[PDB]
Design a protein around this ligand. Sequence first.
Ligand SMILES: Nc1nc2c(ncn2[C@@H]2O[C@H](COP(=O)(O)OP(=O)(O)OP(=O)(O)O)C[C@H]2O)c(=O)[nH]1
Ligand SMILES: Nc1nc2c(ncn2[C@@H]2O[C@H](COP(=O)(O)OP(=O)(O)OP(=O)(O)O)C[C@H]2O)c(=O)[nH]1
Ligand SMILES: [Ca+2]
Ligand SMILES: [Ca+2]
Length: 1203
Amino acid sequence: AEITASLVKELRERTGAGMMDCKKALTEANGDIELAIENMRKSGAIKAAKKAGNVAADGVIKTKIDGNYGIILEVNCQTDFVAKDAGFQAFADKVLDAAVAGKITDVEVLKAQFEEERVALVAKIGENINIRRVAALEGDVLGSYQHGARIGVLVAAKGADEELVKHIAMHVAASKPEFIKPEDVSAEVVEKEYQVQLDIAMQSGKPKEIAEKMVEGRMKKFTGEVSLTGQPFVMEPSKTVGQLLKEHNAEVTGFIRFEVGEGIEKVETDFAAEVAAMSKQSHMSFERTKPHVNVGTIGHVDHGKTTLTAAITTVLAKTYGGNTSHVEYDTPTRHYAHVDCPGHADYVKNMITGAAQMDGAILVVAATDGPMPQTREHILLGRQVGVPYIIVFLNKCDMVDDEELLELVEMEVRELLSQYDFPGDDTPIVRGSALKALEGDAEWEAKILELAGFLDSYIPEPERAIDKPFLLPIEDVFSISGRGTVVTGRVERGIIKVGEEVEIVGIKETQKSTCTGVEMFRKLLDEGRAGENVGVLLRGIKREEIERGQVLAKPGTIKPHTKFESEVYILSKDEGGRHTPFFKGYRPQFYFRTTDVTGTIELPEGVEMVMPGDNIKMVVTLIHPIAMDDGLRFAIREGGRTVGAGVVAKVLSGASSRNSLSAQLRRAANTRIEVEGNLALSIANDLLLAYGQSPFNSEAECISFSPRFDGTPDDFRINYLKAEIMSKYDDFSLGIDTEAVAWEKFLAAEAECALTNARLYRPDYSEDFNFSLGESCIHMARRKIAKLIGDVPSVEGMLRHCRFSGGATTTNNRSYGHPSFKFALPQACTPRALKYVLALRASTHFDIRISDISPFNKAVTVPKNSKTDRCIAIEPGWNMFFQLGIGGILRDRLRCWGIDLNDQTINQRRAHEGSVTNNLATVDLSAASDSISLALCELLLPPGWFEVLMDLRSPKGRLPDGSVVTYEKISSMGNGYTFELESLIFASLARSVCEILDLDSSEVTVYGDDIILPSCAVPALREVFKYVGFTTNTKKTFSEGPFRESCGKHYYSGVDVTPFYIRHRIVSPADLILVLNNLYRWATIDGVWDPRAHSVYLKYRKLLPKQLQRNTIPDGYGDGALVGSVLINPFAKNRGWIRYVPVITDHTRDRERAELGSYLYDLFSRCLSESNAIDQLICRSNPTKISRSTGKFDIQYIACSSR
RNA sequence: GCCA
Ligand SMILES: Nc1nc2c(ncn2[C@@H]2O[C@H](COP(=O)(O)OP(=O)(O)OP(=O)(O)O)C[C@H]2O)c(=O)[nH]1
Ligand SMILES: Nc1nc2c(ncn2[C@@H]2O[C@H](COP(=O)(O)OP(=O)(O)OP(=O)(O)O)C[C@H]2O)c(=O)[nH]1
Ligand SMILES: [Ca+2]
Ligand SMILES: [Ca+2]
């Protein structure tokens, strides 16, 4: 030792400071008990001193009101756990009570008055704490709301009562109103804020008043919303607080709102590379089945917790060979993933959300200080979250010589533990140091190895999924003629062999049956094992008495319940969640395994509001049963949107609306808007005029107007609209205009592939003298293609990418377009394509039948402009099945050239850049995917690929005119890979032009035929394209000037000038609503109208049935309602804190789906899956449902968010 | 009325 036995046996029982701060202040005070007290008392200030250098992010807020004098107080510490401790409560309680009396407002007054007592705890605890600020408020009838402890508010209101200033307090704490009234705002913060926005918009070319008018209406909101007055009342967003006041009788004199840690920093703490940080200082000098265990580390800030998981990692490496920021490390036996629990409220979040589950905590306490008062709250957390086992590491022991004190704290700790029902007597506790464990010190190196040895033995092997009792959440149910009723889904746990009896429990009287079989798309099996997607055939049960939502379990394994208590986390505004709080009523959907189900929730004691971002326990009561057991995760949703996660804790026992409004709307919907002439056009003209431009003279002008690419952005923007807005209208009658031009154009493309097919298979000028650019790019391109693409399409690629999808094939029409009707009905197929089908058939035990074995496809016709149609081709369905495969593989391979064909996004930005910069061109080919001749493909593609492309194409054509074509081009759009093939042809050529000119190939980007490459590359690109068959559309290709367009977006000197198109005779309210929304979106800046267009909007809004004039939805929710402000929608129906606005939909009618074809589509699709801070992993993908579109409209009520 |  260094003293005697228990020399500190009560030198902490009156202090609570460190152990080696009592074996020290009691050695230079020679066993003087009441001396050491003052040696540390006036020395406990150098402590609090060495702490103000530690950021104090966490803490608590307190709130007291004396008759009508109230006070709000922020006394913050630096941790979740300290803020909730018994002590740090008492201190701020008193410092608060001694403030009503001592009516302070100067922080320093109460500060120093306690600065004594406040260096008393800091020492006892170990955290930089203090009283950061204070203020107070006096009014007539004033009140407060205290949101747990994170945040509190003070409201003073004249003319208000008890259940009102409370509600105004609750609101304030939600909507952080930076002012009491719109007019309150600093006529400086705004005299000059109207002088900065006026440039944002006057630079866009907007005329004086237009920009003014616009900036005003927008500054007008910029205040109302940040002002208690112009804020939608949080318990009634239909009306604003402003109106809530004036309406009751009262007004509000003032408010204070405090939130723990406002404007501090909280400087991000990344736990991951952090371990690496301490470790790098000491780095200087088969069987994968193994169990995966999760542990967490929880203790006092730098009691070594950081260093210990750092020591854990290294010492494990020095011996053996081996979410949201986590470090892993290995044992000869098992694998560990380790997290830190820096916060309570933050750990719970991560545990309800599933992002970080605990199998066993390891509590970390330093032996020189022993348990800190707040260690109670650590064991508490584990207790609350219900961490099954806790292991304990005593850190930094070497600095405690009297081994009597080790056995002391060890005993101290073992007490606290069992105070919260953990087995504190029979729990392992290693005594060691991480500090010298890093420093290679084998003596303490072995202590780490010891703790580990426990992670091995005391935290038990987590029960494997395969080992639990079988269970399969039912995604879908089918009746297969002669095979019987089968269900599909993924087996969650256990095994299911054929013959066994299964229980089908879920939503009705749990029923029972027996497993007839088990199969995948290719294999037929006799057992289904955990993690596998299968179909399971039953007997005796019919498909009308099974629902999706139900599970298929081993009998007695699970049971149906309707009520449970649970721990849920509501997502924040930031994380996709709601952006409004909810209260007593909340009635959302709880999505369980594979289905939404609706329920009511009841808050615990003392809580009546809930906000995005906050944890919360609630007792959920569902509208009908669902198999469940403790620990079952669920999502909480609002019409498809996830807004919270949750886990069932304990399961209990279990003991507004508008139908004439619905009909009123339904009827308006089904009306015809009626007028004299051409409304579409009339709208365009009242628009052209409202912007001071000549109207279209005649239907003739609409489709024959060329914009001027000069002048201000504003001047051009409408000028561009004027040339685009009517360009696609399909109902001008005025023209000898047909689709005969479509076939003329088509015959011309063929005629061209003919030419270039001849020219390209014949480049023997019988000479060398002459070297050509076209020739060189083909050669250069071929070589890059082969390196990107391979010799031939990997069986795997072809295997994971072939699929049915979508619309017509040679055998099915629009009505039978769905993938299920492609597996159902026999599909055509090409002579050359037969081996693939037959290969597919040898591939599966299901039926794969060719209907016909023809070489033809159907050229047909769809709309394009007013001037011309577009011919496409409808392919033999089996041929399609395989063209999607190569299409799918080219789609990946293109990624390596920086082309991403899913994301038109990247081609739009580069269009916007080209737009200010002028260093990028946007180029456009004319009859793009009709000019790619056979010859050209064959020069460019590996022969293996080209063969396969010839196998998979449709060789011959079959026109409406009954005639024929033997295709000269390789393929027509309609073909499941011509879009990716044309992308790759175009990219490869333009990249070659890049090298030939010393430009960076990575500057090339391509989506279909929308090509973007450096502006210098274009004249060359032009010539290459001419050589290889293509014709570049000089009109739509821009390599200079202020204009660029790519993939739907059109830019002018960087301002978006993308137009909108009226494609059709507007006839139904929906038609009009749609045009009026396209107007809205094209003429609104952040919800604020250009007034030139606003008048025209208002004018034509009056053509709609009245109810439809005021029925508004937000943006992003479609077009069956006018886009505007949802909080002033009289038909909006708030129902359980989710608001529902009704929108127009197309009335449908159900059709029989093909049971067999829909089940193949399902099983084939699960086959597709196995070849490919988050909880989208809680939801599935849905059953096949067919419907026919009647021309009538309906009204559906859908979920909206206040903004 | 296909392919993205
Ligand atoms: N099957 C099909 N493919 C299309 C369609 N639109 C674009 N693409 C694909 O991208 C390429 C065509 O770009 P487009 O915007 O249609 O222009 P284009 O019709 O070929 O020629 P143009 O410049 O004369 O309009 C080829 C084709 O595979 C379409 O409506 N149907
Ligand atoms: N595969 C396919 N590609 C298309 C289609 N329409 C346009 N594109 C492709 O995008 C390129 C740009 O043509 P745009 O006329 O600006 O229309 P968009 O690309 O469809 O724009 P948006 O996002 O609004 O749909 C041409 C073509 O490659 C289409 O119907 N099918
Ligand atoms: Ca084009
Ligand atoms: Ca294009």
